[PDB]
A paper describes a structure:
In human mitochondria, mitochondrial Hsp70 (mortalin) and the nucleotide exchange factor (GrpEL1) work synergistically to stabilize proteins, assemble protein complexes, and facilitate protein import. In bacteria, mitochondria, and chloroplasts, the GrpE-family of NEFs interacts with substrate-bound Hsp70 to facilitate ADP and protein substrate release. Herein, we present structures of full-length human mortalin in a nucleotide-free and substrate-bound state in complex with full-length GrpEL1. To stabilize the complex for structural analysis, we introduced a point mutation, R126W, into mortalin (mortalinR126W) that is associated with EVEN-PLUS syndrome and has been shown to reduce mortalin’s ATPase activity and conformational flexibility.
Thus, we mutated Y173 in GrpEL1 to an alanine (GrpEL1Y173A) and performed cryoEM analysis on a mortalinR126W-GrpEL1Y173A complex. Our cryoEM analysis of mortalinR126W-GrpEL1Y173A yielded two distinct populations differentiated by the presence or lack of density for the SBDα lid. We term these structures mortalinR126W-GrpEL1Y173A and mortalinR126W-GrpEL1Y173A−lid. Overall, these structures closely resemble our mortalinR126W-GrpEL1WT structure and are similarly nucleotide-free. Firstly, our mortalinR126W-GrpEL1Y173A structure harbors EM density for the entirety of the SBD, and similar to our mortalinR126W-GrpEL1 structure, appears substrate bound to another mortalinR126W proteolysis product. Critically, we observe a large deviation of the SBD in our mortalinR126W-GrpEL1Y173A structure compared to mortalinR126W-GrpEL1WT, with the SBD of mortalinR126W-GrpEL1Y173A translated ~6 Å away from the GrpEL1-B β-wing. Firstly, positioning of the SBD in our mortalinR126W-GrpEL1Y173A structure suggests that although Y173 in GrpEL1 is not necessary for mortalinR126W-GrpEL1 complex formation, it is key in mediating interaction between the β-wing domain of GrpEL1-B and SBDα lid of mortalin. Secondly, the presence of the full SBD in mortalinR126W-GrpEL1Y173A suggests that interactions between the GrpEL1-B stalk and SBDβ subdomain of mortalin are sufficient in stabilizing the entirety of the SBD. However, the presence of an intact, substrate-bound SBD in our mortalinR126W-GrpEL1Y173A structure suggests that interactions between SBDβ and GrpEL1-B stalk are sufficient to maintain the closed SBD conformation proximal to GrpEL1. We also observe that decoupling the SBD-α:GrpEL1-B interface via Y173A in GrpEL1 results in a change in dynamics only for the GrpEL1-B β-wing.
Numbering used by the authors:
A (entry chain C): 59 to 217
B (entry chain B): 59 to 219
C (entry chain D): 435 to 441
D (entry chain A): 46 to 639
Amino acid sequence: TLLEEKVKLEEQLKETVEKYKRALADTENLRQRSQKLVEEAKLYGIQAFCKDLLEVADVLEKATQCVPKEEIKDDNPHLKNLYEGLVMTEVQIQKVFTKHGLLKLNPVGAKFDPAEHEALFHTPVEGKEPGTVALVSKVGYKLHGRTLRPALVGVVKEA
Amino acid sequence: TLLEEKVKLEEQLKETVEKYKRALADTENLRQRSQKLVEEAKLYGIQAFCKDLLEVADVLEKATQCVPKEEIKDDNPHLKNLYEGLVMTEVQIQKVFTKHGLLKLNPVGAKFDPAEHEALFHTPVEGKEPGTVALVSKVGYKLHGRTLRPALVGVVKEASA
Amino acid sequence: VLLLDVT
Amino acid sequence: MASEAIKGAVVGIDLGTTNSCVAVMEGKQAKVLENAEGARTTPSVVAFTADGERLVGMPAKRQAVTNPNNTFYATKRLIGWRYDDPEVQKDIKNVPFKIVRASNGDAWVEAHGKLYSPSQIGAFVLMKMKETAENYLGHTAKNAVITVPAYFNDSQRQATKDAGQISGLNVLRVINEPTAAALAYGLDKSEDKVIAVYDLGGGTFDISILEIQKGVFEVKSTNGDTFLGGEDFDQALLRHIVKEFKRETGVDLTKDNMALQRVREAAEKAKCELSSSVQTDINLPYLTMDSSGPKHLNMKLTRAQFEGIVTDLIRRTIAPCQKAMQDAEVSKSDIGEVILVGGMTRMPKVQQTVQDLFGRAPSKAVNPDEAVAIGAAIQGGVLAGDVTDVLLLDVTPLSLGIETLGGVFTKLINRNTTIPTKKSQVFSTAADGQTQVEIKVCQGEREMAGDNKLLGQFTLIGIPPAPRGVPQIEVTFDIDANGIVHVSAKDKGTGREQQIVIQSSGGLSKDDIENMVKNAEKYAEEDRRKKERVEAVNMAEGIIHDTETKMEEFKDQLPADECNKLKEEISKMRELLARKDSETGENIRQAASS
């Protein structure tokens, strides 16, 4: 009679405590899943922003590079000020990209890498190893160690 | 002692049952809050990148307006190409901004709204209704209702008379 | 004898 | 009284003079909440409009220029002080807003002919913080743990309690800033010690000598400089930058307004950069417009230059700390640990000064900007929440799972999963006509079956005949508390269940948590590549088997000599050089139509 009360209470205590630990351990996994979901959403948003931001840097780099360095003289002040402003803006853009993970890719002479380098054309070049980036036609970019846009480069072939 | 011990242990049983009820409430609240926070991190989440590119955009705008616009002729061809490249960069960055909800705030004649406009002077301006923007010293930027940089405006004041 | 995985 | 049954959410509202912060306890680690604008620190500015409003925060800093006589800022210097006090008498002259005496002779503030106590301004700031906490949490946050300066006497602590009560918050306890910093750094469960807190970077510099005897914190002494803060350092750097620009070119930026703001932001960025790197570059293209043309600023700044600019400000923190040591009756040898709080304590020069001043290496493990808020959140969680229950909740040491037909290691439970959990996943037969199903349970992190470990093996015997993919088997893990994993395989539809009580669920608790995970991250891309290769082989052989079965069903008037893509599929299979066979899997042609 009264002895059954102890057994019933002990069994109920054990079952309820196990159920409570089950309830308090599911919320932790749910919180971890929530944090992972938030991280992935943020990463995808930032990747989408970077894919559109690359073009601004490309356009500014081409515009500045197309001006030869010979004609920037003190007798053409309007071009000198503009060139200085543009190169400073380019390095500012690259600084901000590097701060938030967007890294450049200029493997001048580095070995070919399908992950980050794309072979626009193949042509043997003297003095360079086979399968080595002799020239870079288009610069590539990386995000957090994952290639966002492969660099279009030329691969030295065998002659 | 047996009866009081049993009573105390049953009270602990009821307490842990109500704790389990609280745990269910907590995990449901966590589910709802996670569903809200994923949306918040999807709409926003590029806030640092935009807040850092605002100054590049302003510098490009200043560079576009810098050239006196009278020396860009065929006599100086390299200044022409550079200016057109800079203008192309300006329009490209403005197209990239608005693709992600980054809308410029240029309230030349709107009412002074402190949630988006950082007042700079309270100068009295004649012929303009009090509480508007006399001029925009710097264009603001916002994305999805979350202002990133107030447009540094100058409000007008009522006449002293 | 090797269990499969449901897609 | 008995258990108060708080059963609610506890938030730690770090109510500061200029900036404020609110934090909550997200399980085992505290978290700082971002406000509506996405910024973690809410300005403690309360501004009133012409008709009536209560703009608080950035919507009140922005409007302050048009409303200078109704923008109440830095009012925490008037809390709990009478009207006839020396500090209030020095403060009243400088502040634009009107300060009036109350009925009880207390220093209040006035707005549009209405009396506002310094407690009510804090109440409005607390209301903004509670609104932010309700926006994040979802429900109402009723209980809070507010923080006050360590020198706040009983009257000012009572005023802070009244402010918290006015805003509709259940103020459990009003905590000290050094106590909250110690809790955030983790010194609550510590032996007897004497610790010194170094608070530099805000609107004031405070140094307090704490003692952790018996597990309670008793503040032995407090000291510091009132007129020294993080704004002076930024102003010094800005003055250096503008002076150097004027020296180099000849245009003074003090007359400018937008250029000054650009220079200030660049100086702040460089100062925040001159703590992890020796040198920095300050580029501000098109800074000023002149008759001869635009001028672009370009300055290089070295760490030594910055350390020499502000060496007087750093050296002004040497005498108050020494006097705090003297009053507390302790020396350099009696201090057990130094606690760094404040935004400017990340500069290696400041930490070098602290080490030279206490003889101890300061602890830099907690973000000094948000140490008070996190400490208040931890103390609040301990005081009324149930967090130590989660603390004792053990987690799985390393991930578990079962084997796969293609050699893959399916992850049913990940690595860092709380122990008392149950998870299930359905699985199908290996091939058509199979009646014997074996389960291989192993523990590891690599994406391979036998490359990590092997806990055990059992076989689920007896399956009714059925085509491949139709039978369903529920392999569910029933790991209970105290790391007792009950691996069980369930055959859905029929009987013949299996169940094992595999032991050694993290029994070898060692550095294996950190060293089997260190080499698992380096060997990840190759592991993913080989897993993708074997999955490609698996689906390729499945497709080829389906194609062969369909071909052996229809044979009459079947000129399938052109349908011999199975040969090239097999040839590609015996080739460990291609990326994947997914693009070559277009071998499901069924032109025969059964």
